[PDB]
Amino acid sequence: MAGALRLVLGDQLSDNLSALVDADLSRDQVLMVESRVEATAWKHHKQKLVLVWSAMRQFAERLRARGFNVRYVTLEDPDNTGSIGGELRRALEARAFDRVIRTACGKWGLESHLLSLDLPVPMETREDDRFLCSRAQFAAWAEGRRELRMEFFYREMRRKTGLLMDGDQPAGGRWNFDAENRRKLPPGLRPPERLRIPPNPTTQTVLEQVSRGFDDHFGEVEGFGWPTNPDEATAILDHFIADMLPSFGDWQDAMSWRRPFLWHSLISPALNIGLLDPLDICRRAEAAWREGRAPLNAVEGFIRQIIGWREFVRGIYWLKMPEYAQRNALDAQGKLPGFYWTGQTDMACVADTVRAAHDHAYAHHIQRLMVTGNLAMLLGVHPDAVDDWYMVVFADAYEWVEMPNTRGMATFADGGIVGSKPYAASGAYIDRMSDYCKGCRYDVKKRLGDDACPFNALYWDFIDRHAQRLAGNGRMMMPLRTLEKMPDAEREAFRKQARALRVKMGVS
Ligand SMILES: Cc1cc2nc3c(=O)[nH]c(=O)nc-3n(C[C@H](O)[C@H](O)[C@H](O)COP(=O)(O)OP(=O)(O)OC[C@H]3O[C@@H](n4cnc5c(N)ncnc54)[C@H](O)[C@@H]3O)c2cc1C
């Protein structure tokens, strides 16, 4: 009869939060904490800090309007203990509470710490039902599978959600339409201007506090253009479904110098804090095709990314955690190059990627994977350091989705649990889907020499090094034949050029 103390973390700003459903507005109280422990666990991008904290403060006001009692502890409060557990104990000392209600979070280290907390009252933990697949449904699907592939999971979510289904058959007759016919942009096709949200009063105040207090964190805060409440986020989604969704897919993998956004949705930073809903989004995209405003392939490719990939990596993470976070399949022990933070690189494709990380805290999926991620796995950088960089510089970065994408797909450290194969590539690829190799100090058609493309030699060293391991996958074959046809002076050439580059790039 005392009431419930309900917690709401920074990435759970949703009205339908399982922790808030069934609240007694007359007895219960909601807790929201701006924690410097969570803000410093990594040194997140300045923009990621502004986004979360500005969204939280507005979300609280939304609850106060509806009649919710909300205890909001700011990062200014001189009594804020700085942690979730500390402020949980401080709330229970203020008044009486029957129990505590919360929703499982997206960080294993945190969700584990919280389950162990010794509290004077019981603590009920509920599942995060905003996701289309529950942690116990993925493990059921997985049982007995030699390898976990995404396409088969995807077909199972299409049949469960009913998206893009006409009867029991997939719209199209085919489940998937992704093809190999990718390419770069023409000389004359300029990408269209994208909609950026000007900071509202509250966002402006958070931006000022972050510029002053967190000056050491990575990235620039000027030009912040992310949405912070459902209204702003909805405008961003309307802009994508109307202007960009048709051509989505046509350019899903291309790359353009000084144009990081291209035809992407830019919704991950809002979706991951809950300002949007995954199901609602996929139904808008289907309605777009159903009604004739966008082709089917564009809609199926986009929807596949949300009910397929996004739900898949989460299903892996919780299934294999906490051992997943300690796996180093290739035994990489090299430091990260300094230009991953400073951007000072005559490699024009990596620099544009850090510039977009610095100025926009964003980079689309192909860049994170085939440039910086491909590189990180070629040089052989320790996976812990790679995870750090990806959790810092990007505004959509949370462990449950970052780690299976990086430790798994990009660098193969997990050993193929996520990706099935290493996405290793030479400079020929980047030249194929981008326009960097035009104005770069390096030659994309040279393998060795201080004017040659590092990706060429570094790629051939990654094959020779792990040749006897790649033979097992069966899909990394072809590069192994070319790994032959090599006069031992040729093979030996890139190996010392790889060592030279390594030492040069500062990775021992
Ligand atoms: C090395 C690496 C690290 C990544 N780290 C993150 C991360 O920390 N957070 C994150 O949300 N995504 C991450 N991704 C996935 C992908 O890069 C981003 O989701 C995407 O770039 C965000 O841009 P967008 O919103 O315009 O996506 P779009 O291209 O518009 O795609 C639509 C939606 O699909 C989802 N999606 C697409 N690809 C993936 C994927 N591989 N995994 C999960 N969801 C996906 C996102 O919710 C995205 O908003 C990573 C990918 C790689 C290769």
Ligand SMILES: Cc1nc2c(=O)[nH]c(=O)nc-2n(C[C@H](O)[C@H](O)[C@H](O)CO)c1C
């Ligand atoms: C930067 C940040 N700040 C806060 C905060 O001030 N308060 C909070 O409750 N959560 C914050 N978070 C989110 C968590 O640290 C964590 O990354 C997610 O909740 C994962 O579920 C983040 C990521």
Ligand code: SF4
């Ligand atoms: S030549 Fe190599 S380093 Fe230069 S842009 Fe092309 S792939 Fe990148």
